[PDB]
Design an enzyme around this catalytic site. Structure first.
Site, PDB file in Angstrom:
ATOM      1  N   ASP A  21     -12.519   9.671  -7.778  1.00  0.00           N
ATOM      2  CA  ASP A  21     -13.703  10.064  -7.139  1.00  0.00           C
ATOM      3  C   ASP A  21     -13.480  11.393  -6.420  1.00  0.00           C
ATOM      4  O   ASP A  21     -14.152  11.691  -5.764  1.00  0.00           O
ATOM      5  CB  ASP A  21     -14.162   9.041  -6.442  1.00  0.00           C
ATOM      6  CG  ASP A  21     -13.503   8.614  -5.222  1.00  0.00           C
ATOM      7  OD1 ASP A  21     -12.347   9.008  -4.943  1.00  0.00           O
ATOM      8  OD2 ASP A  21     -14.181   8.014  -4.695  1.00  0.00           O
ATOM      9  N   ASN A  41      -8.855   5.626   3.123  1.00  0.00           N
ATOM     10  CA  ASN A  41      -9.307   6.467   2.261  1.00  0.00           C
ATOM     11  C   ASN A  41     -10.337   7.521   2.741  1.00  0.00           C
ATOM     12  O   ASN A  41     -10.884   7.344   3.667  1.00  0.00           O
ATOM     13  CB  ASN A  41     -10.401   5.575   1.426  1.00  0.00           C
ATOM     14  CG  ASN A  41     -10.956   6.231   0.103  1.00  0.00           C
ATOM     15  OD1 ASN A  41     -12.126   6.626   0.453  1.00  0.00           O
ATOM     16  ND2 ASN A  41     -10.408   6.488  -1.039  1.00  0.00           N
ATOM     17  N   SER A  85     -11.324  11.543  -3.959  1.00  0.00           N
ATOM     18  CA  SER A  85     -10.500  10.972  -2.601  1.00  0.00           C
ATOM     19  C   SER A  85      -9.167  10.715  -2.654  1.00  0.00           C
ATOM     20  O   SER A  85      -8.666  10.742  -3.767  1.00  0.00           O
ATOM     21  CB  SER A  85     -11.438   9.760  -2.182  1.00  0.00           C
ATOM     22  OG  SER A  85     -10.849   8.719  -2.899  1.00  0.00           O
ATOM     23  N   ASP A 121      -5.996   8.525  -0.500  1.00  0.00           N
ATOM     24  CA  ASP A 121      -5.632   7.489   0.461  1.00  0.00           C
ATOM     25  C   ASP A 121      -4.418   8.079   0.986  1.00  0.00           C
ATOM     26  O   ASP A 121      -3.334   8.549   0.590  1.00  0.00           O
ATOM     27  CB  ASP A 121      -5.431   6.105  -0.265  1.00  0.00           C
ATOM     28  CG  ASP A 121      -6.369   5.508  -0.974  1.00  0.00           C
ATOM     29  OD1 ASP A 121      -7.598   5.860  -0.864  1.00  0.00           O
ATOM     30  OD2 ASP A 121      -6.243   4.539  -1.767  1.00  0.00           O
ATOM     31  N   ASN A 126      -7.513   9.577  -5.931  1.00  0.00           N
ATOM     32  CA  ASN A 126      -8.191   8.806  -6.756  1.00  0.00           C
ATOM     33  C   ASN A 126      -8.952   9.622  -7.485  1.00  0.00           C
ATOM     34  O   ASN A 126      -9.355  10.923  -7.512  1.00  0.00           O
ATOM     35  CB  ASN A 126      -9.143   7.864  -5.815  1.00  0.00           C
ATOM     36  CG  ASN A 126      -8.343   7.045  -4.795  1.00  0.00           C
ATOM     37  OD1 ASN A 126      -7.303   6.356  -5.268  1.00  0.00           O
ATOM     38  ND2 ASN A 126      -8.274   7.378  -3.519  1.00  0.00           N
ATOM     39  N   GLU A 133       0.831  -1.388   0.084  1.00  0.00           N
ATOM     40  CA  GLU A 133      -0.028   0.041   0.122  1.00  0.00           C
ATOM     41  C   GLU A 133       0.845   1.367   0.034  1.00  0.00           C
ATOM     42  O   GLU A 133       0.521   1.977  -0.723  1.00  0.00           O
ATOM     43  CB  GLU A 133      -0.862   0.026   0.995  1.00  0.00           C
ATOM     44  CG  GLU A 133      -2.059  -1.060   1.263  1.00  0.00           C
ATOM     45  CD  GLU A 133      -3.200  -0.581   0.091  1.00  0.00           C
ATOM     46  OE1 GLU A 133      -3.184   0.355  -0.358  1.00  0.00           O
ATOM     47  OE2 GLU A 133      -3.799  -1.470  -0.210  1.00  0.00           O
TER      48      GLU A 133
END
Ligand SMILES: [Cl-]
Ligand SMILES: [Cl-]
Length: 127
Positions: free
Chosen positions: A48, A59, A50, A52, A46, A35
């Site tokens: 959308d 998220n 968002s 991380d 991301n 990750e």
């Protein structure tokens, strides 16, 4: 900071992740490797809107609040900025909530794709 493998395994174990909700410690170390590459400051945007955040790439649409993500739910009740600390407490506490939500560690795409189904105990071997 960038954790070493065994260093992170020991910290995750002190924070109660070994066998938590049915996931042995090697799962969590493998998840962190793929990750964030063990970096507590990793961030990734991301499609959308968002982002991380941190060692476990938590998220900002569902779990932490970053103030700039549409549809935020903040289910961990934590600012995303706290998840970029070198101390993993806030990220672990949110991870425990995530993994208890009903789909296990499948929340972590890198774990699903690159850890699940492998011998994850190898990630704590030698520690
Ligand atoms: Cl393990
Ligand atoms: Cl934030």
């Amino acid at each position: 900071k960038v954790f070493g493998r065994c260093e992170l395994a020991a910290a995750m174990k002190r924070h109660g992740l070994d066998n938590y909700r049915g996931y042995s410690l090697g799962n969590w170390v493998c998840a962190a490797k793929f990750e964030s590459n063990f970096n507590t400051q990793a961030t990734n945007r991301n499609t959308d809107g968002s982002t991380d955040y941190g060692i476990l790439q938590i998220n900002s649409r569902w779990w932490c609040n970053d103030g700039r993500t549409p549809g935020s739910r903040n289910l961990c009740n934590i600012p995303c900025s706290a998840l970029l600390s070198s101390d993993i407490t806030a990220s672990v506490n949110c991870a425990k909530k995530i993994v208890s939500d009903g789909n296990g560690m499948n929340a972590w795409v890198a774990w699903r794709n690159r850890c699940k189904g492998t011998d994850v105990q190898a990630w704590i071997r030698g520690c």
